Design a protein around this ligand. Structure first.
Ligand SMILES: Cc1cc2nc3c(=O)[nH]c(=O)nc-3n(C[C@H](O)[C@H](O)[C@H](O)COP(=O)(O)O)c2cc1C
Ligand SMILES: Cc1cc2nc3c(=O)[nH]c(=O)nc-3n(C[C@H](O)[C@H](O)[C@H](O)COP(=O)(O)O)c2cc1C
Lengths: 133, 134
């Protein structure tokens, strides 16, 4: 059978980054991040917790994704967007983000699960198939 | 403190298929699969549970993965390989699989966490870039 520890081990085994955030006003702040997230972003858990994830956009602040993300957050609906993001050292990567609202039965509160997929290679590839044709 | 329900939701939110297996003798049986895995393979959970993953390999004939996975697992070592796999309807997809051994900090029985990611599209695009850039 399955127990709690193995669930955690499943989350730690994950390649895609996985985070949990809670909504405070128009900030959605990080209460959990896995190791995949740390290697993808180059940030440790201890630096980044209790802050909104928008910092990964660095100073690239005009992304349509942002607006749609916010709307979905308001409506308590899942969304998937592709953003340009930037690691700690400043390196750039393409991030397909999935946000799933889930209401926790403990405090009856809605939490947001992010899942970050690194799509950078695919980005540069379809950009090449398109540009050649 | 984030809780068990939230962990289960993290697993159900996953893009990648996720499975858990325990070792029986010479084969590793699934004690768990998430929904991504079920819809990816087209096989439901109760069809495939408590049996070894080899059915996903289908009638495809191939080595490097099967043997090296068997070896790494035998040796309690991680591996990642890309295999041609087939859904229930028979359709083929490219499956990038990563299998990791689990450390039992309690409850001492041996576990393996597999992750099945569908890379078929990226495969097809680079074959298109390769053929075009030729
Ligand atoms: C759970 C969760 C995870 C998120 N992860 C990322 C992320 O990895 N990268 C990013 O650029 N934005 C991420 N966001 C989006 C921002 O944190 C923020 O909520 C969104 O950009 C709101 O739009 P705004 O910047 O216009 O305020 C995430 C949001 C949530 C709720
Ligand atoms: C945790 C775990 C997950 C696995 N997931 C898959 C999978 O998704 N698809 C697949 O073809 N084989 C998967 N395998 C491999 C099979 O279980 C088995 O090792 C494979 O069919 C090789 O066959 P053989 O070593 O018995 O010859 C997984 C193995 C483990 C331990």
């Amino acid at each position: 059978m399955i127990n709690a520890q193995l669930l955690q081990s499943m989350v730690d085994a994950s390649n895609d980054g996985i985070v949990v955030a809670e909504k405070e006003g128009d900030d959605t702040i990080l209460i959990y991040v896995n190791a995949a997230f740390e290697y993808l972003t180059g940030y440790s858990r201890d630096e980044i917790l209790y802050q909104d994830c928008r910092f990964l956009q660095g100073d690239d602040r005009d992304q349509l994704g942002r607006a749609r993300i916010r709307k979905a957050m308001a409506e308590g609906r899942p969304c998937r967007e592709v953003l340009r993001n930037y690691r700690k050292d400043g390196s750039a990567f393409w991030n397909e983000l999935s946000i799933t609202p889930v209401k926790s039965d403990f405090d009856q509160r809605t939490y947001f699960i992010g899942i970050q997929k690194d799509v950078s290679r695919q980005v540069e590839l379809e950009r090449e198939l398109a540009e050649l044709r």
